[PDB]
Ligand binder design. Structure first.
Ligand SMILES: C#Cc1c(F)ccc2cc(O)cc(-c3ncc4c(N5C[C@H]6CC[C@@H](C5)N6)nc(OC[C@@]56CCCN5C[C@H](F)C6)nc4c3F)c12
Ligand SMILES: Nc1nc2c(ncn2[C@@H]2O[C@H](COP(=O)(O)OP(=O)(O)O)[C@@H](O)[C@H]2O)c(=O)[nH]1
Ligand SMILES: [Mg+2]
Length: 168
């Protein structure tokens, strides 16, 4: 039923666009980059009604004790980079290690997301992202918030992952 998802990623990669697409089915062209906020979507995934509580983490860099305990209640994570930025791909490792830290676990459900797949300025290879996703034991998804491609499939896969982490 309830699954706390966290869309992590560097400023700009389209975490808020991928949030507002899953929740409202439209491309927002200007969501405040200083606004970090949570959003729930009741969707039915594979027979089971699921209240996905998605946190779009997007503000300033803080690491308070409050924020640890907060991201430790996050059960699953979308590591969101943009195909049109390399720093955004190199930041995916950083996000994964903050998750491994706050979760005290090597085995936390994650899904690599190569956002902005519609732009013709690919700087991050699909092989790279598959290589980075195969080293983590996580699925890799290429998405487009502008065109919703892979959006559902991304968040849905993450919950399928979280489903598989619970039967373990
Ligand atoms: C996330 C998360 C995160 C998790 F998944 C899990 C647990 C966490 C527990 C924390 O206590 C705290 C976090 C946490 N919260 C906010 C961060 C952040 N703010 C700044 C901007 C860019 C995103 C958004 C959010 N707005 N930015 C960067 O890291 C980016 C880089 C780029 C410049 C320097 N830093 C150091 C690294 F090299 C990479 N990390 C952040 C971070 F860990 C956590
Ligand atoms: N073309 C395209 N632009 C995107 C996509 N996702 C986000 N953007 C753009 O990237 C900019 C910043 O994205 P935002 O959602 O603010 O990312 P955040 O700062 O990581 O939350 C926005 O102006 C969006 O128009 C996408 O899939 N395709
Ligand atoms: Mg944002």
């Amino acid at each position: 039923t309830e699954y706390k998802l966290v869309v992590v990623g560097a400023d700009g990669v389209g975490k808020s666009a991928l949030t507002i697409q899953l929740i409202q089915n439209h491309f927002v062209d200007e969501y405040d980059p200083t606004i970090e906020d949570s959003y729930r979507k009741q969707v039915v995934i594979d027979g089971e009604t699921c209240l996905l509580d998605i946190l779009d983490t997007a503000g300033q860099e803080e690491y308070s004790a409050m924020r640890d305990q907060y991201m430790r209640t996050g059960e699953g994570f979308l590591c969101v980079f943009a195909i049109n930025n390399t720093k955004s791909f190199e930041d995916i490792h950083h996000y994964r290690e903050q998750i491994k830290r706050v979760k005290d676990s090597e085995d936390v459900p994650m899904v690599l997301v190569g956002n902005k797949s519609d732009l013709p300025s690919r700087t991050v290879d699909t092989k790279q992202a598959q290589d980075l996703a195969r080293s983590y034991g996580i699925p890799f998804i290429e998405t487009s918030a502008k065109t919703r491609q892979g959006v559902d499939d991304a968040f849905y896969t993450l919950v399928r992952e979280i489903r598989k982490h619970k039967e373990k």
